[PDB]
Amino acid sequence: INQVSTVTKVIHHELEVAASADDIWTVYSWPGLAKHLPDLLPGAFEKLEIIGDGGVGTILDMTFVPGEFPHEYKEKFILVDNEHRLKKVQMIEGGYLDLGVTYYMDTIHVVPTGKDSCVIKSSTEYHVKPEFVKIVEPLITTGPLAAMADAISKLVLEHK
């Protein structure tokens, strides 16, 4: 058996942030982040189960409150690269994998732009069977990338 042909899609999001790349990367790579995601994204989760210490290889099983699609998926931290401030997170079970998608990968790259500024360059690459393209296209957006970037940016910048 050969696995079916697929089409590749890549979507991109950028956020300019008035803090250093080191400051922003500190949050994206904090091993404690996974377990504190419900603080970071209030009311988003029905359930969150973490297997691992928060570093590379950690698996997160995320269940969302009703009215969200997806309702549940597992993700894994594939890369947490300190030298390039590059994080990769793969959807490994559930979510869009139950809607004709065979590969789904989020990449976040925190790029310095000046002494106290950076840009958070977030992207999603997915591979989708051709008859599911029109069905998944409106569902897979930069929304979740933006939500994370916005929440991290605000955590670093704001002063309660």
Side-chain angles (χ1 to χ4, degrees), residues 36-114 116-133 135-153:
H36 294 96
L37 285 170
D39 299 327
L40 197 68
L41 299 174
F45 298 100
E46 160 173 306
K47 187 161 97 124
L48 179 58
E49 177 163 30
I50 286 141
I51 315 189
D53 65 358
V56 66
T58 297
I59 291 151
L60 300 83
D61 182 345
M62 301 182 155
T63 307
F64 301 87
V65 293
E68 323 299 301
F69 187 85
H71 175 56
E72 177 163 22
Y73 55 79
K74 302 192 178 129
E75 69 178 18
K76 186 171 176 195
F77 289 176
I78 299 306
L79 184 73
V80 183
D81 176 347
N82 286 327
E83 202 196 17
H84 304 123
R85 304 185 185 87
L86 186 72
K87 191 183 193 169
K88 294 182 156 197
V89 184
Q90 186 168 8
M91 192 178 289
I92 61 169
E93 194 170 349
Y96 307 102
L97 310 170
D98 299 334
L99 220 57
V101 168
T102 55
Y103 175 83
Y104 186 109
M105 183 75 76
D106 284 346
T107 296
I108 294 102
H109 189 188
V110 180
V111 183
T113 59
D116 284 302
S117 67
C118 67
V119 57
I120 299 162
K121 302 205 188 196
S122 302
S123 68
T124 300
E125 175 175 345
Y126 70 89
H127 303 171
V128 57
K129 299 169 194 186
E131 73 275 27
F132 290 81
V133 164
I135 291 161
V136 321
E137 188 274 340
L139 301 177
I140 300 182
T141 71
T142 61
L145 306 170
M148 200 73 71
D150 295 350
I152 292 172
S153 179

